Amino acid sequence: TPRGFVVHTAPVGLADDGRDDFTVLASTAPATVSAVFTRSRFAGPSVVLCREAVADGQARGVVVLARNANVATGLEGEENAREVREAVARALGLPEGEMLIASTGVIGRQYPMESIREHLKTLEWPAGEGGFDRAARAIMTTDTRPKEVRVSVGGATLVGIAKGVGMLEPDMA
Amino acid sequence: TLLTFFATDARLDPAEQDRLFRRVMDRTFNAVSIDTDTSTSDTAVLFANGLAGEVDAGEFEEALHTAALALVKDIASDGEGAAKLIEVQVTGARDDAQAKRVGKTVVNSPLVKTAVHGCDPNWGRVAMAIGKCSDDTDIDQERVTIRFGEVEVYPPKARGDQADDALRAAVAEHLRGDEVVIGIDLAIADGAFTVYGCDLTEGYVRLNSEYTT
């Protein structure tokens, strides 16, 4: 519902079920951003990069990958996270620091880069807006159902989507 | 892993927004616990473009609170394996931060969590739970109250077991709903805080045993 939001979703073989598992949520318009994150000693590289992206309180989107958390995947894992984050920004004609990355799923498992590579090469701006439903499904792992919520305030709309029901007691800052 | 992202066309002051986002985040997503296992990857973001013009930061903070909170209960109802949502409401703490510390200890107690699952009014476990906060030496068991739904099981007024027998039965009734409420007063100062979680089912064990997640 809110203006200038578009949603990209697709299967990338994070699990082998052909389920949408790769989301890009972006804004056709510059967005001020507010965000908090885990403070884990095994913070994944997706997190480090986000903390960096939001440092200027200025960000236009997030690419989220579900069914692989990309954590404790050493230098390579850090390299794929740079790679996925940069290539999403780039496919969308956006500056790097204006795009964040978030990844959920198993620990200690390398991305299916071969597969993500090929999808990226097709990635482009979804026409029309909204689709937060697709995004709420596409991020979901041990969740039995999607989680969406929408509110009107003073002529503007605010939507939210969430996920997680295990490995869950956030302590974010 | 918790992931949640919020998107609005509201124009807001960037400063007031971060500040606003933090206060809602601490009351909601920072107030929920399924297994205590704070992931490696949590991420909560809000995107705000000005596309619809200037909203009252106040109206917005309310709106967001209402939103994150719906998603939070939604998280706890869906807790891996869960049959029941546990809402632990703490008041009378020395400060808010103790309230939540006491809240969290309660909802994170396996013994509490299983008692709520089995519908066994084993409130004494909620006593053990509070007791666990052994560094808070101003928690006085003489002054502390406990309730499940609208029934106070502690402290014992009078003598014997008949007060506890009836009303433990009343607790067993309230437990049968899909949402259990634990109320706890400390009688110290005005610290208040509600935390959320869920019963610990056997589904929880099967899921996290038989699958790799």
Curated annotation (Swiss-Prot), chain B:
Catalytic residues of the enzyme: T1 (nucleophile)
Organism per entry: Streptomyces clavuligerus
Binding site for substrate: T1, E80, N208, T213
Stated name of the protein: Arginine biosynthesis bifunctional protein ArgJ beta chain 3
Span of the entire protein shown here: 181 to 393 of 393
Originating gene: argJ3
Taxonomic lineage from the root: Bacteria, Bacillati, Actinomycetota, Actinomycetes, Kitasatosporales
Domain of life of the organism encoding this protein: Bacteria
